[PDB]
Amino acid sequence: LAQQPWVEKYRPKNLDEVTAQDHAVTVLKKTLKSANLPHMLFYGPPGTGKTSTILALTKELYGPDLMKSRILELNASDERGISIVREKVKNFARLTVSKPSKHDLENYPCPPYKIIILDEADSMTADAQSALRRTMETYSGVTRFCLICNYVTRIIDPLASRCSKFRFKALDASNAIDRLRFISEQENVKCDDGVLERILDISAGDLRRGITLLQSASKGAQYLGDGKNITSTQVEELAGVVPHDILIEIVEKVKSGDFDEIKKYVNTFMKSGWSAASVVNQLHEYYITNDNFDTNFKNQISWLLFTTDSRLNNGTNEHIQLLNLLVKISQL
Amino acid sequence: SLQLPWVEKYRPQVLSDIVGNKETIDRLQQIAKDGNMPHMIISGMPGIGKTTSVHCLAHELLGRSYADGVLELNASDDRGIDVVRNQIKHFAQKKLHLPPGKHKIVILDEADSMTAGAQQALRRTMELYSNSTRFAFACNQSNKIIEPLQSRCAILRYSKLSDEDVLKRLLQIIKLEDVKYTNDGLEAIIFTAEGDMRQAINNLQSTVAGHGLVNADNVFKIVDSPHPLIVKKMLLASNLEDSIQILRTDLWKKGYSSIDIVTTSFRVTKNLAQVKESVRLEMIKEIGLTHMRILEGVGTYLQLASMLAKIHKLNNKA
Amino acid sequence: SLWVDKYRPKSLNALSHNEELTNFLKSLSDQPRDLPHLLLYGPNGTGKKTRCMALLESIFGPGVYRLKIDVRQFVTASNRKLELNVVSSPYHLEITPSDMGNNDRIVIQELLKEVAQMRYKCVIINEANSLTKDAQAALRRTMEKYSKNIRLIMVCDSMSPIIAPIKSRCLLIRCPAPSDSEISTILSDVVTNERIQLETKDILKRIAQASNGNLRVSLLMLESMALNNELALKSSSPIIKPDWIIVIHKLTRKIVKERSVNSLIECRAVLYDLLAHCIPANIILKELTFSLLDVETLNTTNKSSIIEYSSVFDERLSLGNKAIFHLEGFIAKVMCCLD
Amino acid sequence: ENLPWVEKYRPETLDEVYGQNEVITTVRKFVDEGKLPHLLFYGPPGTGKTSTIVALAREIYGKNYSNMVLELNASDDRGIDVVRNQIKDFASTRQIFSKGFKLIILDEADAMTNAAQNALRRVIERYTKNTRFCVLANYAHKLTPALLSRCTRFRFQPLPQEAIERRIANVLVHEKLKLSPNAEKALIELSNGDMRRVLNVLQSCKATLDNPDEDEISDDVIYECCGAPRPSDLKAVLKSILEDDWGTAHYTLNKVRSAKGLALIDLIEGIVKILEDYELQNEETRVHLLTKLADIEYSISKGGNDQIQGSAVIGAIKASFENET
Amino acid sequence: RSVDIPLPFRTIPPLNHNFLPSDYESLKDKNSASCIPVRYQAPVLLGTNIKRNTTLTWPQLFKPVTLKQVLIEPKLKLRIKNWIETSFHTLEKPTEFVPLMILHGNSIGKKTLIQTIMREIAGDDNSYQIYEVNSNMNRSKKDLLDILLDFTTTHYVKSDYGLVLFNDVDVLFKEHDRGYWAMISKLCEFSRRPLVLTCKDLSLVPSELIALASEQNSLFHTKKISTSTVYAFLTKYLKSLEIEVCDDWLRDVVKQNNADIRKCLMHLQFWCVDTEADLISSKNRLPVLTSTLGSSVKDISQLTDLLSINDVIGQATLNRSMVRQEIDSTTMTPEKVNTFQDQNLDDEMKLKFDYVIDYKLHLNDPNRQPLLPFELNIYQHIQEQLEARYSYVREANHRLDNEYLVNRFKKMTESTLNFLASRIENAEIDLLSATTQQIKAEINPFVFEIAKSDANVKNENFNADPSIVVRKWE
Ligand SMILES: Nc1ncnc2c1ncn2[C@@H]1O[C@H](COP(=O)(O)OP(=O)(O)OP(O)(O)=S)[C@@H](O)[C@H]1O
């Protein structure tokens, strides 16, 4: 109530207010003034402004009071393709438009069709090739269904045929930095030089992750009570990133080549608590990007890191996997 | 109009005509001759002749009293708790005068689809009225019938029909139907049957109706499955490019899904003999890994290509 | 009963080592209005569950330690009696995924729905790493849909198998292993409350170095050595290691000295004896590998092969049902390499 | 009128069902002979199974088709109970009819449960004399052998280009559209034997045109309307991996994936398909490339970090094609 | 852009498939080595026994006639017999005795025992009147309360040796058998005849009835009888019929039917008819199995790696079916529990989907369903091929299980808790809160160390009773 996560507290309420993404907001305002959209799909990195954009379209389309009744976000969730999604969709088709508001008239076209939001519903245990095709044909004039997706790997061409596919472009670092700095200024987040760039670097363009990390860092800074500017080390610790000093020690040890030294260092490093997956990712960043290594070395280390990461993802012991990876890199 | 299928036109009306499982069929014949039919659960794969065995046993046991002494309940009929508590119990309590030793038969075909509570209610019904009626189940899977029901019946596990019995009855049908047969065609019919006798009869009927003379090529035209020789050439080719071309053209572009290709490859490899047993088992392991990856969700063309590459490595090397 | 239980810090102030984490948890409990979903990760025996329990006590009260056992029985498709001990409390609930195998999704969602049926109730999840991907997705759905009434605190020894969304919607808290001095201080406190007659303080340091940053192992070794010598620890007093570790050492010795099929049959019998005593195969493989790597008659190439086969067979163990096959295959490959 | 081209260009008779010819010839022989056994039309979606059965049912049953044919769909909210109820009520009624052989078209039977399939087999066996079933499915491995043995299976293959292009010519002239040869080739190679996809993409391309009267549709229009990797993009990624530096290859891969919204699985599959056309001097190159890329795809399906997977793809291709050199 | 790949184009040769019948002849299935059905002798029927030419089932033909022939331990037989006589004598007097017996357990003669006791008490079959309430009828309050009250209140028209037996008191439907336990309680209040309850488990019986029966020492457990006595009884039964059989096949019959006298008797009723056909394979013999050494360690390494990969394949594919298997309607699924929780449904709808009352929730995964028999299973083929040439694979298939190593874990934890509590409750909850892996790896072995240390000093002469934990790990 009094507290609100900054991910949803600073969500763009106006459609045109959505930062950057002109190619989407312009066409979307045209479609909104068209008083009817076809069922549309957007693709981009999760957290680039998909849900914010669709909610803002509904904001400038329907009324705020009409909102929580007309929109049912039956997304990839407790709701099941037909067990609940289809049942609730048809029971909502049994429901008509509620009382028209005041400012809603003329200002908010409030088209009769309803909007149903399904975020990443392709990742569901129900494969509805035509279970919702029939329900958006029988209820085309009284509802529409909008979907959220990551890539252009669309599953079924039916139910995804008449789609105005909007490419939510990757959010540029400048505008993302501007938005995060604006949020920090509103929330009086005392940060020195380098916090926001580091947050964007770990979040890799994900503003949602960036905003949550900034909120967590601010909460930790208030917890300490020092009142000092947040450091990049705290942000790194709040995300699981191994410190660069440890990674440099790791690469020096694997340059040394001795099996015993590497084994002892890995034994002492497993007690620190830093995960092996972050070590593998930062080793990839240090080795593939570096221009001081031959093409053969990078080619071999790519497969080595890939195998290590694939084994680590399958729930295996981190000690053995990291020791094997570091030894194999040493033999390279 | 319609022509009677050879599956139905040449259905055994007596227990002696039924081939396969000689011991069980002979014992069922002896039971039908003498009487005192025990409760039985005939189980096994599809198409080996379970329902035919039950119906022939009931007919031979009863005779003219078959109409009023046998109650058949398939999955199409309702077999709920109410049905078991009323209809089956009233049939068991019915007073029918039969020759001594003979008993009324309650044929519950496809008992694996019956609900558990109906099976529990059937247990007391069969235990109480066993002096007048005897029950006979017929399920594809024997584990779907509750242990209380299985402890009051003689479980019959029919086995897959061997090549010899299928060949014998097929020769009988070909001889009474004036069918031109070739050794390769009949061998193809056995191979596509895989112990399913109904499948063998249907394939023979389809081949005769469509392409007349039963050659192996004619049999492999009405099975709508990957051609075993094509799959064998794909797996056993010494050039990987040729195997990839075969998989792309004759299998992937023709609409054969990954499951059918994997099944045909596994069957061919299991039937392969020129390669060693260790090589056979290792290729079978690669096919199993590919089938596993398909079951997880990764059933793309690249997985089958990698399977072919591994099989090529295993064949050319080692 | 055990000193690992009686001398368990039951308050945030009672926490001795990792003072930064203690301050962070105290500040988190300073406002009990909002607990973000916590993912406490680190080495085993580092006080992760102790700190979670202390934080829950500080928010609610000393009741969070009054635990009741509610046994839940479930039946799957193949009719197996899936029996679970669901440790509950008037304020919190505790569950453990591994105790239900592959089927850890339906049971987890049923228990979480039962919790949500009735400010908030915190659900503690031990070994969140062992959760399958579908169960982790169900947890991700729960953390967003059931955020108002359920706060999931997950304790895992490794966060790497956890999916990205769960990490993204959780406060990642790391628990580093206590240093040798901190373990020695804790053991000295246990000693001075239990009146242990040491001849010197070096014994505690030896215990700490033998336990390798594991507080539970160090405390149990203290208790065992104290009760063996009747509260009379000495320099000559050997470190009490569990029997399975000694059996693994003997197995490694046999593997190094005897490379034969009959030796492999004997190794299989030893593995069967170890697994029959309810010892998880992952730990058995870990100790076997790290004891084979410490053999002083082996060069670099053999040890690299040992670590490679250990990684491969650990991955196979994580994805397999019968562990004896994986362990025997690892032993056979090791013996083939050692030739 | 205001209808999708899917329903507008439906085959109203058996002569308009292109591509599948063996099935149509057998069905025409069936109707001419009068022997119509239980049919099972299965294959990839959009091959023309429903079109075939609808055309045949209309051709046999004239005007009474509305009452003599019941079209079911097991995927709906009925379950075994209501589905069985409807089938037995339609099959055992023997309503006032001109002739007989009431036809039941059960669509999406691969979603029917095992008990439901056995019950359907029993119902088919009981009411064979008056009711003929033409159970429809998409995959034959999801159907029980009991149902598979009571029906004459008729596999549908993906339509051949010669047909897809004929229906292209038919729809284009009637709807007054222009397809450039490269765009037509792209649509034909992108449909993969799916006429429904062709019609949907064609209608979307019509709607896309600023003046949908004489504006020719280009290759890029179809490749962006369908949402598929362009051959140029995959070829550029492949050549950057093959002949450029590791940093440049990584930059090109990331840029293409971000700009085209292309997942790594599609990139791997397209690279494999393109490299199939090209010849390799060695064979270990092909073996290692296929095996490593399949392993990468399998690991991608389970999950991980995409940067390491992309680096693994680049390294696998580079190592495989340095083996040949 | 063209962006040409630096690779020459490939001209694909045109593939043709002209297969000679010689290649078709190679499709013949090679003779399988894994399959090995070994037959037994035909049964040798001796003489013309009147029992052989019977019209009743063999389990009922050999129905017990006294209390000596029932397959139950004599102690419990005597206890039940004395309880029934005492109940008859007490209820004869005007009436602290609630007539109730719970005859729980997993034995077979849980109903013929009561009938034989009645036959012995009355001396005649017609005298005793046992009213069996079986599951084949509707055991609901509004259908049976009046009938049972009238039966247990007045005298039968004919010593009134009357009894009510509730067979299968564990399987009860939620709506069909409504108010059943209320009926049992009301009968217990207003009965003058004994009330026997039989079940396979005691969990379904309400705790009130359990406590009431345990107070009167009327809770009797039927333990399963060892296979030796079942085998001896079967040999005597076949001697009565004068049928020769090899003792190996009879041993196999006893073993495979879980020592069930009724199941074994039905199996012998089938497989002992006067026919020349050979007997069932029963325990399948070894498929020319040679568990050899394997010579070089490389071969056994390959075999073990193949075994590990096959185990991975089995774990990955043995529970992923492609055909959507259905969920049983008469099961206590959570959806069914919540459905009956809603009061919108009337009595008629609840009759359609009535579920059997249970204490264990029946959860199911619609996606991860077990493989059907007709689906492809390469894991089974690899397992049967490897077992046919290596016996230790077949041994490993059953050396360890899932119920095993978990019940052992439970017993080990119980012993550890007992040893800890015997210190010269808090553990019961906190150690349980400690993760199962931690108890398996660290707590239990160290508790064993402490137990063996305290057992050492006891032999020399801070905890007592250490021999149990010493025995558990041994
Ligand atoms: N263009 C943007 N301008 C301002 N804030 C943004 C923008 N894009 C994202 N955000 C912030 O990030 C949050 C999530 O953005 P969205 O992408 O709309 O949500 P989302 O699609 O649900 O994210 P995922 O896919 O579930 S991780 C918003 O609530 C904002 O706080």
Ligand SMILES: Nc1ncnc2c1ncn2[C@@H]1O[C@H](COP(=O)(O)OP(=O)(O)OP(O)(O)=S)[C@@H](O)[C@H]1O
């Ligand atoms: N051993 C056999 N000898 C002769 N005909 C057989 C034999 N087995 C099967 N058939 C024929 O094949 C068909 C099998 O029919 P059923 O016995 O009903 O099949 P099933 O064994 O019950 O398996 P289902 O129907 O899948 S549960 C009949 O037409 C039989 O005539």
Ligand SMILES: Nc1ncnc2c1ncn2[C@@H]1O[C@H](COP(=O)(O)OP(=O)(O)OP(O)(O)=S)[C@@H](O)[C@H]1O
């Ligand atoms: N062989 C064909 N000849 C002509 N039009 C075809 C052919 N195959 C498909 N089509 C067209 O493509 C669409 C396919 O419609 P349907 O036949 O209903 O789909 P289907 O082949 O039954 O597959 P689904 O996805 O399981 S409904 C229709 O618009 C048809 O006009």
Ligand SMILES: Nc1ncnc2c1ncn2[C@@H]1O[C@H](COP(=O)(O)OP(=O)(O)OP(O)(O)=S)[C@@H](O)[C@H]1O
């Ligand atoms: N020596 C014996 N002792 C006991 N029962 C015997 C003996 N010989 C044969 N039987 C048969 O074993 C069966 C035991 O009685 P049942 O009523 O069928 O079983 P039950 O008591 O209901 O227990 P269940 O079946 O596990 S619920 C009867 O059919 C008896 O004829």
Ligand SMILES: Nc1ncnc2c1ncn2[C@@H]1O[C@H](COP(=O)(O)OP(=O)(O)O)[C@@H](O)[C@H]1O
């Ligand atoms: N701050 C601390 N001070 C003293 N002892 C501690 C502290 N933290 C943990 N311990 C010891 O650790 C034991 C519990 O470890 P636990 O938290 O269960 O390990 P894990 O987190 O690996 O499950 C207790 O017996 C307690 O004595």
Ligand SMILES: [Mg+2]
């Ligand atoms: Mg979203």
Ligand SMILES: [Mg+2]
């Ligand atoms: Mg049948």
Ligand SMILES: [Mg+2]
């Ligand atoms: Mg259709």
